[PDB]
Structures are given as structure tokens and as C-alpha cells.
Coordinates of C-alpha atoms in Angstrom, one line a residue:
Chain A
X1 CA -77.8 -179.7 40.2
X2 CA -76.1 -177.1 42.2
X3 CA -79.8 -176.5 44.5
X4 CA -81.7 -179.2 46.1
X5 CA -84.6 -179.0 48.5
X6 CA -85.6 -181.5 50.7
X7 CA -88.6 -181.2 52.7
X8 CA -89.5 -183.5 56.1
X9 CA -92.6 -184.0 58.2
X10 CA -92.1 -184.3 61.7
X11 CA -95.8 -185.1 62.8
X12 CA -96.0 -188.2 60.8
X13 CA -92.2 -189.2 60.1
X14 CA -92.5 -188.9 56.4
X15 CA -91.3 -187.3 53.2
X16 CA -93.2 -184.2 52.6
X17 CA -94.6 -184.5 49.4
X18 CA -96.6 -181.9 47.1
X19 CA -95.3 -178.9 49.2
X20 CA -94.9 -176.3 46.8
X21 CA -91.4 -173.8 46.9
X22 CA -90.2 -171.1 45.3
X23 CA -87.1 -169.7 44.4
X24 CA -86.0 -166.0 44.2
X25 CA -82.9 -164.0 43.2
X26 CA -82.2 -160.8 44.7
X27 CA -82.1 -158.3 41.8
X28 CA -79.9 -155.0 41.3
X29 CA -83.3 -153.3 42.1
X30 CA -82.7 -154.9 46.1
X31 CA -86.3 -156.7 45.1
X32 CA -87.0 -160.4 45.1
X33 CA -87.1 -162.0 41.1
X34 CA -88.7 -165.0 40.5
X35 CA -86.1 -167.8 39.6
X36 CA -87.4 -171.2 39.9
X37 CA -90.4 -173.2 41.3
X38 CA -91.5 -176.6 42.0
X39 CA -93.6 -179.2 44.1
X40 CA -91.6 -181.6 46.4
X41 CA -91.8 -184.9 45.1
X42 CA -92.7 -188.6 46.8
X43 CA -89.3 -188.9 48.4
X44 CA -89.8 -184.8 49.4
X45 CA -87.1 -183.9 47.2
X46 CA -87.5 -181.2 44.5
X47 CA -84.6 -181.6 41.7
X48 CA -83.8 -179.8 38.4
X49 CA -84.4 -175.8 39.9
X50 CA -81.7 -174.8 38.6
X51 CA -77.7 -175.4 36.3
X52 CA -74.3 -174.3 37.2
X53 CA -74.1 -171.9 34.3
X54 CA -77.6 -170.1 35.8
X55 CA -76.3 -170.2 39.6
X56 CA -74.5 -167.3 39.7
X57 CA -73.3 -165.6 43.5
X58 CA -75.9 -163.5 44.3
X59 CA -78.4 -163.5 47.6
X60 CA -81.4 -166.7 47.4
X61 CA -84.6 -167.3 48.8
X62 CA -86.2 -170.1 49.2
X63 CA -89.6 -170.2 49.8
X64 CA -91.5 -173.2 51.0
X65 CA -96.1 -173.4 51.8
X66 CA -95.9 -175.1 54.6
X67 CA -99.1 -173.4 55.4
X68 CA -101.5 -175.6 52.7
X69 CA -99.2 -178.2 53.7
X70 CA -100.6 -178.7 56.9
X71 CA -104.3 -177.2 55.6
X72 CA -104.4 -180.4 53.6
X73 CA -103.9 -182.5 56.7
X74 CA -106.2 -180.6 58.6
X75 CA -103.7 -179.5 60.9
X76 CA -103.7 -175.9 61.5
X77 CA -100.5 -174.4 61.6
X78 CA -98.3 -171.3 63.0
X79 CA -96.3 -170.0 59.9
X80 CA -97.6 -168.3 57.0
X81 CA -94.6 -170.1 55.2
X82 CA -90.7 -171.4 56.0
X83 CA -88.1 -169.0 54.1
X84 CA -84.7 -169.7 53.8
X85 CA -82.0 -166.5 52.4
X86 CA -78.6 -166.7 51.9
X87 CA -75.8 -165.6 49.7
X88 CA -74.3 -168.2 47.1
X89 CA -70.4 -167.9 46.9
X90 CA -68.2 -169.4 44.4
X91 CA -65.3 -171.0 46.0
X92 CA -64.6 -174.7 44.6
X93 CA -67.7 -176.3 43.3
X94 CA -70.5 -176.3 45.6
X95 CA -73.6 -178.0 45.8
X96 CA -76.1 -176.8 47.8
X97 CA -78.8 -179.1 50.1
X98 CA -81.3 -177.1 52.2
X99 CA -83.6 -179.1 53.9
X100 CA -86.6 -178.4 56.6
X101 CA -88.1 -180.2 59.0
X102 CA -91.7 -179.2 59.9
X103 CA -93.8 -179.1 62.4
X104 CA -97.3 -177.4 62.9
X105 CA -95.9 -174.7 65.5
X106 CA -91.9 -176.0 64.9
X107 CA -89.6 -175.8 61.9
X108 CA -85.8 -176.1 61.4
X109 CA -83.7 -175.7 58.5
X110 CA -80.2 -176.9 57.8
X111 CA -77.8 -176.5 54.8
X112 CA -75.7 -179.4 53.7
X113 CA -73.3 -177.8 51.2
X114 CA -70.4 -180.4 49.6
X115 CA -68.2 -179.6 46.7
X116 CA -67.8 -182.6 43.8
Chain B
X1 CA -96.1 -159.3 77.2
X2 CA -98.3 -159.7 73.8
X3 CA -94.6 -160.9 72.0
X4 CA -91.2 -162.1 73.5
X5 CA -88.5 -163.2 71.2
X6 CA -86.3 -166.2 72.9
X7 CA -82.9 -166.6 70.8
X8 CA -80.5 -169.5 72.2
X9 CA -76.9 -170.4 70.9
X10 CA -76.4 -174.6 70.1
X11 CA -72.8 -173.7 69.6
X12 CA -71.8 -172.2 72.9
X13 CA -74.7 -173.6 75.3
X14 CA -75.6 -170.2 76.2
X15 CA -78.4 -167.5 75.4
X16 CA -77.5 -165.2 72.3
X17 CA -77.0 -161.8 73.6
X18 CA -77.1 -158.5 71.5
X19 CA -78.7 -159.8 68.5
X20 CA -80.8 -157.3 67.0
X21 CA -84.4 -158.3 65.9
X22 CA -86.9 -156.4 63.8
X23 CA -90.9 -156.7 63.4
X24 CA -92.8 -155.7 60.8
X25 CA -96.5 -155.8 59.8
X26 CA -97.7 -156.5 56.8
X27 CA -100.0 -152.9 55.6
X28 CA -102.9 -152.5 53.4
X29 CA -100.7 -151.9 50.4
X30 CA -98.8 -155.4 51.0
X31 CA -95.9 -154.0 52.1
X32 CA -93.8 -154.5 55.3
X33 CA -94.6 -151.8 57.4
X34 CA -91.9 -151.3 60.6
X35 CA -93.4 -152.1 63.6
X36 CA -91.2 -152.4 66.4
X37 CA -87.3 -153.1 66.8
X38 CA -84.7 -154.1 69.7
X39 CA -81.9 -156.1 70.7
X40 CA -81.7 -159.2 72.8
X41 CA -80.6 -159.1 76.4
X42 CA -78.3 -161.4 78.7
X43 CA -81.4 -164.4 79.4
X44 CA -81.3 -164.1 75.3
X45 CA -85.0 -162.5 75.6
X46 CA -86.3 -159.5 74.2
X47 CA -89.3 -157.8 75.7
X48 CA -91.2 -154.6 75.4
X49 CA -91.5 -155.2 71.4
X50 CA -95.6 -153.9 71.4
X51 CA -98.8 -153.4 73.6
X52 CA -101.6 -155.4 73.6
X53 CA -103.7 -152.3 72.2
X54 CA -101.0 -151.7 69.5
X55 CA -100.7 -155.2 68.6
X56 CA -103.8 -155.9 66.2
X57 CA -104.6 -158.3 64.2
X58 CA -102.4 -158.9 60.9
X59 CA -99.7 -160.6 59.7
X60 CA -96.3 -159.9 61.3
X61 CA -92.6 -161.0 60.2
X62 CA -90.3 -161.2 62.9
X63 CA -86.1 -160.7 61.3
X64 CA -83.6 -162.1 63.2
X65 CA -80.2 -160.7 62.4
X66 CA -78.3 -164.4 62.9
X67 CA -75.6 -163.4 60.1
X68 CA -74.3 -160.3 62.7
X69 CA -74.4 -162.3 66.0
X70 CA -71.8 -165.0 63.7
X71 CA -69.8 -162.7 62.5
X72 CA -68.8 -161.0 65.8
X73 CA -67.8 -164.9 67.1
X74 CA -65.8 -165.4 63.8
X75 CA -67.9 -167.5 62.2
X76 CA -68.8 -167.0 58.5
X77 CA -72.6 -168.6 58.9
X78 CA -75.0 -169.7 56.1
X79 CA -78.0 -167.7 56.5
X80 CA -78.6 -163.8 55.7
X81 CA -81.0 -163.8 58.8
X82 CA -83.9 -166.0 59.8
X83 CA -87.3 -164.8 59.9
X84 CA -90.4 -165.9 60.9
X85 CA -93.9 -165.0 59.4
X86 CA -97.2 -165.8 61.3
X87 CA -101.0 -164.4 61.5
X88 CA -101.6 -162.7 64.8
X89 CA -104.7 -162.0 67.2
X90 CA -107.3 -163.2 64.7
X91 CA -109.4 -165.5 67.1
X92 CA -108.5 -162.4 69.5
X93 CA -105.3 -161.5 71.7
X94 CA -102.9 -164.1 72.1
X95 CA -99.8 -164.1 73.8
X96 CA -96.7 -165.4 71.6
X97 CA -93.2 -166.4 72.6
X98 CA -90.8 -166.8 69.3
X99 CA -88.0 -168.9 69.9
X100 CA -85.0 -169.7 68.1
X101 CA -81.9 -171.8 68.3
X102 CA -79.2 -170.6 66.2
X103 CA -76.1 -173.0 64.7
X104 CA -73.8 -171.8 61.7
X105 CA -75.5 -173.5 59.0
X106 CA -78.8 -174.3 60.9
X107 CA -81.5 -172.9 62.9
X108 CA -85.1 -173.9 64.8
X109 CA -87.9 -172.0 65.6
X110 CA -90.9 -172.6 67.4
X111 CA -94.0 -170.6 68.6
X112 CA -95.3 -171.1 72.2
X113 CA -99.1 -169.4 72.0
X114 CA -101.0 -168.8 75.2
X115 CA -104.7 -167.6 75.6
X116 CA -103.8 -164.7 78.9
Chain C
X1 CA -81.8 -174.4 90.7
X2 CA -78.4 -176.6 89.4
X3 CA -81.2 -178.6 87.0
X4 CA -84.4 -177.6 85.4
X5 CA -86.1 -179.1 82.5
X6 CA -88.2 -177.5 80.2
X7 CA -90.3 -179.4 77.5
X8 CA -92.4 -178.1 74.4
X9 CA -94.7 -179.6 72.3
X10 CA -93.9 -178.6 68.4
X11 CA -97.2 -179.8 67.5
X12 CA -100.2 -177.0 69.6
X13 CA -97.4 -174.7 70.0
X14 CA -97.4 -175.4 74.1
X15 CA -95.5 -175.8 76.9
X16 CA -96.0 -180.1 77.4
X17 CA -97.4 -180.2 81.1
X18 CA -97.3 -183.5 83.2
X19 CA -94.2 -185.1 81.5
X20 CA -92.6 -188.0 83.6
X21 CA -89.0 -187.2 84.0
X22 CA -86.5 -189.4 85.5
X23 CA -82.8 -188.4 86.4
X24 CA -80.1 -190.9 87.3
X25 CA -76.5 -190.4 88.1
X26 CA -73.7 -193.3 86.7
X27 CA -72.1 -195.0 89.3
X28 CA -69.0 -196.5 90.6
X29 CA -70.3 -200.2 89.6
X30 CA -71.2 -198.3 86.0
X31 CA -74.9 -198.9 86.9
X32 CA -77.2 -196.0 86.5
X33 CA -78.7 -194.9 89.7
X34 CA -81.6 -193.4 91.1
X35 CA -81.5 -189.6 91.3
X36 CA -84.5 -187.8 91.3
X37 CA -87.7 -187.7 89.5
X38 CA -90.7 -185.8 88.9
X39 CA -93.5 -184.0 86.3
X40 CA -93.7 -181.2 84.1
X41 CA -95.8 -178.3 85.6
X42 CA -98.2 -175.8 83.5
X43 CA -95.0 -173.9 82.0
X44 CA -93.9 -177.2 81.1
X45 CA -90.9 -177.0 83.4
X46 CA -89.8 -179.3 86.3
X47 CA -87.9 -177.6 88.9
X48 CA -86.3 -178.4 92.3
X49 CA -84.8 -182.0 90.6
X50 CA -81.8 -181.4 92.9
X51 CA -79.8 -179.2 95.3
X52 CA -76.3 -177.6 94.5
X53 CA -74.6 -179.8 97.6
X54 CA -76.2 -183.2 96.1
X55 CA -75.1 -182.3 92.4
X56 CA -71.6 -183.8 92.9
X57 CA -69.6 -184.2 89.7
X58 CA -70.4 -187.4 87.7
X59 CA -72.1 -188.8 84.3
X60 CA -76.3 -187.7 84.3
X61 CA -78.9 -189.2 82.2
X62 CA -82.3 -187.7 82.4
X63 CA -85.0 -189.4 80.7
X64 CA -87.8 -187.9 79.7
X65 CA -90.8 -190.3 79.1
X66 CA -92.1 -188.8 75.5
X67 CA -94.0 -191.5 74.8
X68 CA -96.5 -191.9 77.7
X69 CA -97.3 -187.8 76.4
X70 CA -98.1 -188.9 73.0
X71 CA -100.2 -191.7 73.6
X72 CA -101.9 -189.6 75.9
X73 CA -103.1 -186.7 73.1
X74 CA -104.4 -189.9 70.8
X75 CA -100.8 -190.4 69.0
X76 CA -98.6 -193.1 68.4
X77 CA -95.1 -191.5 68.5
X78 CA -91.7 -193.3 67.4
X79 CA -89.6 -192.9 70.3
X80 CA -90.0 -194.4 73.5
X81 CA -88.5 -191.9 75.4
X82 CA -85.6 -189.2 74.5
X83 CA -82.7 -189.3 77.0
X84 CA -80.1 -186.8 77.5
X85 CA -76.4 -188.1 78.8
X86 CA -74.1 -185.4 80.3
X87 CA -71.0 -184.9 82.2
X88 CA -71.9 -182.6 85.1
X89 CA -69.8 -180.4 87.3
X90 CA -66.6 -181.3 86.1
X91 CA -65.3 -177.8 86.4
X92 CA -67.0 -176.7 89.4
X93 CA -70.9 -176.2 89.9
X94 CA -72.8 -174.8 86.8
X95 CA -76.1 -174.4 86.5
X96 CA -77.9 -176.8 83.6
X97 CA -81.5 -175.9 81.8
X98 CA -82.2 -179.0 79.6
X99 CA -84.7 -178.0 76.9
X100 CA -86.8 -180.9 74.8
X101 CA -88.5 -179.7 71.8
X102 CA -90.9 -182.6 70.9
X103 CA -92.6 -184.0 67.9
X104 CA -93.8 -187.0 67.4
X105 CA -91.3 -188.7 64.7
X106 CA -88.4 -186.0 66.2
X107 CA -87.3 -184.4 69.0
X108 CA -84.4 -182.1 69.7
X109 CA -82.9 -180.9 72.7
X110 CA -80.5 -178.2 74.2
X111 CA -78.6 -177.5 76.8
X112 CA -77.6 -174.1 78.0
X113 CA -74.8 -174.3 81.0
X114 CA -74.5 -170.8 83.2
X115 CA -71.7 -170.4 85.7
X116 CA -73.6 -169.2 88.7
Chain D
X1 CA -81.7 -202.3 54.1
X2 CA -84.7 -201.8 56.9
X3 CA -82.7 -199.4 59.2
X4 CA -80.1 -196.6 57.5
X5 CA -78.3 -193.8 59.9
X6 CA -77.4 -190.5 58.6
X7 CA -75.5 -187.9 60.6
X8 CA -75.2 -184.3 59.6
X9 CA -73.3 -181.3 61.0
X10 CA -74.9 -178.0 61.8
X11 CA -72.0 -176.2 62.2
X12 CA -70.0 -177.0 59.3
X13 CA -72.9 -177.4 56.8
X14 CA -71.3 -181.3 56.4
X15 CA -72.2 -185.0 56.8
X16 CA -70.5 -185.9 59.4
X17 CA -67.8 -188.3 58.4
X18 CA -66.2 -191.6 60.7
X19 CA -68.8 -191.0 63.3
X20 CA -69.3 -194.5 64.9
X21 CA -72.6 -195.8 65.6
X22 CA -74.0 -198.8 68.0
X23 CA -76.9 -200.4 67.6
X24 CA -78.8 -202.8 70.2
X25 CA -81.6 -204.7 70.5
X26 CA -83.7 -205.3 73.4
X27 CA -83.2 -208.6 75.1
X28 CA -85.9 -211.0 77.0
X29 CA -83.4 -210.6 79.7
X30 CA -84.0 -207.0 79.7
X31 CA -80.6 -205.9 78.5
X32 CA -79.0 -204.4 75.8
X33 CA -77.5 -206.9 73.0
X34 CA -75.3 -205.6 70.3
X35 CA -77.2 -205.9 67.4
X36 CA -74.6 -203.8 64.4
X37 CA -72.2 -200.8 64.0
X38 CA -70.4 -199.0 62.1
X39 CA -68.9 -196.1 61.2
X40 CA -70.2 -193.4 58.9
X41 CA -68.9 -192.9 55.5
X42 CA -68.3 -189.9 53.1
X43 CA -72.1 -188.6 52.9
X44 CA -72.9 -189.4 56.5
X45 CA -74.4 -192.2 56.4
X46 CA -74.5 -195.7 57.4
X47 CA -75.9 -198.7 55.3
X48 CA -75.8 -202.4 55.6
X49 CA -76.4 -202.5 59.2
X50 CA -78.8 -205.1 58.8
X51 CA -81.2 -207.1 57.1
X52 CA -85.2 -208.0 56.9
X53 CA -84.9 -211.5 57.8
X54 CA -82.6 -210.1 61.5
X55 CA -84.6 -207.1 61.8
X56 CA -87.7 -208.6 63.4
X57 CA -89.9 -206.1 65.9
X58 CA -88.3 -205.2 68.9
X59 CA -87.0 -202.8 70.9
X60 CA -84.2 -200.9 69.0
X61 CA -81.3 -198.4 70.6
X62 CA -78.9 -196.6 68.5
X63 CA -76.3 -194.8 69.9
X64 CA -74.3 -192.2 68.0
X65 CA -70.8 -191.2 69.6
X66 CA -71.0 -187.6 69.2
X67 CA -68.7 -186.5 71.8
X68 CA -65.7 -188.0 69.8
X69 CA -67.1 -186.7 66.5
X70 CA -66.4 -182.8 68.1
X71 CA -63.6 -183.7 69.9
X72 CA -61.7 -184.6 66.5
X73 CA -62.7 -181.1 65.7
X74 CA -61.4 -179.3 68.7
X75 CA -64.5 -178.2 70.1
X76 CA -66.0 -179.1 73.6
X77 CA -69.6 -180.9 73.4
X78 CA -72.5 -181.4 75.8
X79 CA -73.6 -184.8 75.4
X80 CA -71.7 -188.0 75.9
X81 CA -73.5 -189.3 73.2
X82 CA -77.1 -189.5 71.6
X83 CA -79.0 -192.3 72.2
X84 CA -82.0 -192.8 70.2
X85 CA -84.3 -195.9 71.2
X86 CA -87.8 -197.2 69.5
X87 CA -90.3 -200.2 69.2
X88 CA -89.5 -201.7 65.3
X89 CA -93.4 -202.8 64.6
X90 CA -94.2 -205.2 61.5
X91 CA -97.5 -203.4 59.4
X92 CA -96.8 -203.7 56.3
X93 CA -93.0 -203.4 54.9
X94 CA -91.2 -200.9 56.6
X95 CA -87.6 -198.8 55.9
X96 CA -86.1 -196.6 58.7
X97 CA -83.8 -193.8 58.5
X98 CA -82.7 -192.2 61.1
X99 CA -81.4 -189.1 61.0
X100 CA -79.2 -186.8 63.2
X101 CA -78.3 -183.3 63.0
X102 CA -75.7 -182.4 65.5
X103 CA -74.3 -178.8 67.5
X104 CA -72.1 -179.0 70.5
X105 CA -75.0 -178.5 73.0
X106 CA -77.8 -180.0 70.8
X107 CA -79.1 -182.1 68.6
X108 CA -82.4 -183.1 66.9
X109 CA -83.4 -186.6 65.6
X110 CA -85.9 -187.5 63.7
X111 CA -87.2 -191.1 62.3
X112 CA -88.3 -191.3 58.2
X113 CA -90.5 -194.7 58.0
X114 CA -91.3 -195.3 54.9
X115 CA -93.1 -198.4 53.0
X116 CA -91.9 -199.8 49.5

């Protein structure tokens, strides 16, 4: 597991759980493939997107809906979603944590990044 | 102003100065159709981005070129840029201030909407 | 001013008008002493808190009653209040904005320091 | 484990290691009574602090020594410390993280409360 996504609410001090996301991989083309997907879990964690072998260096996004996050809660919200884009580098192992925090009008988004 | 973009640096303690932001709104075709551009000042504010008779309703993505403003300082930071996404003016005008507080490997943002 | 406050509420995208704030300076028994207080206006800031000849060097605390807001809008938050603890003026005079960005299970808060 | 502490650093994309932390409880005196501490280990965090049978309702204060945590690092902070103080309430079982994400001149906490 070389990508986790850990998703927060700040509102109610919970795990965000059932928050879809969506991964992408920029391509040659400079347009945004498809590369993983997932709902968040009960402990707002979504595991498993993606192996070491598959997680090559390239440029990521990771989408997350916080909008029908907050529709479901009847909450209405600011952001059409939270996006997250970076560039993977190989240099020792790395595993990569990127969690948000959200908020109705408010999010944050932090990487943890360690290497086993 | 119909949109003000607010940038602050948690490193330094300071406003972030010369980071260059770009709006787009999304067009009929779904694309991302340029909208307006600039570059932060010293209070870490950018003004004079639209008009409240250019600024219709749609959806607009706000780009803010963090990776650049790290570079220049030294720093080799986690995110390509950070954007923000939202639906504008569709209960009628609104005024919004975007706001963002940049770290190497983290960033906030946050929407303050007024009714002028 | 030397110290201004400004406080924003994650959750209707708003400045957080009529906030208690306290401010107390440490001091030479180690006690924390009265130093000035006062209430978030419709910006949601609180100026004129102090005056550059009063704003000696020393250990601040401002504490900014969260709670009282909360319970207020119909919430039960998780904090009682959210305090900020700073050495001030150590250098000479600087000018301090203290920023609160609140939640109701998080809050975060930034300082940005100008040399006037 | 009712109460866990995790510290994270934005500008390193790390836990933050060997930050010491300082818990009190409110007393009928109206004073603060060490309650646990500890430092944080290799994934930030801090378990074992206490247990449900100690851990009746209250008022809780932890303290997180942030201001030795950067100067270890060579870099000048802000804050003396964060300080992070709530009401512990019995309603069903309840766990408590709380969680920390530091910068030089800001940080954000936020509480997790969960039920098992």
C-alpha cells in the first residue's frame, strides 16, 4: 500500500465515511486517466488503491465528493469537490498518506509521506 | 470586489507575495475556459480578478501556483498547486473571498461569502 | 494596531461576529494577568485590544471563548475555548494579526507578525 | 485507551517524533492537576496515557510543547505551545484522539470521538 486516503469531518468530529474518491494519472496526452477509485470506509480510510509495482513517478490526483458528502447531511456546502495533485518520486520507499479535513465552507489537506 | 483571493504563509508568519493565481470557468463544452489571471500583492491579496456584470453564474476553479511560491524559498513542496472549485452567483451575486494558508506539505482553504 | 484578531466560522462560510475575547499578559509571580478584552465586530475582527506603548515585551495568551459561539448557533462543540500563547515584542515592536479558523470538533489558527 | 495524541508536521510531511505532551485535569480547586505525559513515538503518536476506569468526565487540558519540537529543527516558531482543553462527557463509550498538525506560525487541532 504505497497510497492511503484518509478522510475527517470537522463538523461532527468523526471519520468520514462513504465519501467517494478517485484517483487519476496524468497521461503522455497531459489528460487526466482514470487509475483507481473507492469509498472511504468506517474508520474514513480507503486502502488497497493501488501496489508498488503499479505506482510508478508520474503526476496524481486525488479526487474526493465532498459535495454529496455534506448533501447527505443536509448541510449545504462551498466546494464542488477537494482535489489533491502532486508528483510521485522514487527516492527510498515511500508511502504516501493524504488526508483532509472538511468542513462545509473549510477544508485542509496534509500529506504524511514515511519510507518502510 | 465580486472575488478576492487571500494567500497567507504558516511557515514565515507572513502574507504570500507574488504568487500567481489563475480562474477559470467551466464553458458549455465542459471545459475550463480562462477567465481572469494575476499575482498576489504585498497584504497577500489579489483584487481586480472580474466585475460583477462579467461574473455570472457557473462554476469556477480558482489555481493557486503554491509549487512556484516554494520553490523560490528553497523548499521542494508536496503539491503541484492547490485549487479550489465552487458554484458561483446561482441564488444571485455574491461576494467571495478565497483564502488560503500554505505549508510545504499542507494547505487550508476557506470561503468567506457575503450577500453586498 | 500592535493586536487584532480575526475569527471565521468554517461552517456558513462567515466572519464569527460577537466572539468573547480575552487577552492576558504572564507575570512576574508567573500568574496570568488581566490585559484587555473585548467582542468580535461584523467583519469578525476585534481591534483597538491595545496600544504600541502598553504592548511591553512579555508571554500573551488570548483566549478566545469558541464555545459560548457554538452553543449559541444550536451546537455542542468540543472545545471550551482555543487559546493562543506567544512571546511578544522580544525583538522590538511588531505588529500581530491572530487569525482563528473555527469548526466545531477543530480549529486552527495563524499568526502573521509585520515589522511596522 | 480513551484518549490517544497524534502530532503531525506540515512542513516536513512527518509525524512528529519526541514531542512531549502534558495532560491535566481540572481540579475542584480550580486548578490544573497533572493527569499523564509523555512523549511521542515513531508514528506520532501517543498511547497509554490512560485508562477508562481514571478517565472519568471532567475537564481535560493537553498541552503539546511545540516550540521545542521546531527549535530541534532550527527553525523559529510562534507559539509557546498548543494548549488544547475540553469537557470529557460519559454517553455511551467514548475514544478520543486528538490530533495536531503543526507549522511555525500555525496549527490546527481537531478532536475524533468515536464509540466502540
Amino acid at each position: 500500500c504505497p497510497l492511503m486516503v484518509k478522510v475527517l469531518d470537522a463538523v461532527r468530529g468523526s471519520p468520514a465515511i462513504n465519501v467517494a474518491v478517485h484517483v487519476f494519472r496524468k497521461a503522455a496526452d497531459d489528460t487526466w486517466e482514470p487509475f483507481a477509485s473507492g469509498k472511504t470506509s468506517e474508520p474514513g480510510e480507503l486502502h488497497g488503491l493501488t501496489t508498488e509495482e503499479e505506482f510508478v513517478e508520474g503526476i496524481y490526483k486525488v479526487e474526493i465528493d465532498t459535495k454529496s458528502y455534506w448533501k447527505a447531511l443536509g448541510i449545504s456546502p462551498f466546494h464542488e469537490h477537494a482535489e489533491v495533485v502532486f508528483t510521485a518520486n522514487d527516492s527510498g520507499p515511500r508511502r504516501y498518506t493524504i488526508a483532509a479535513l472538511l468542513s462545509p465552507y473549510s477544508y485542509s489537506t496534509t500529506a504524511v509521506v514515511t519510507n518502510p
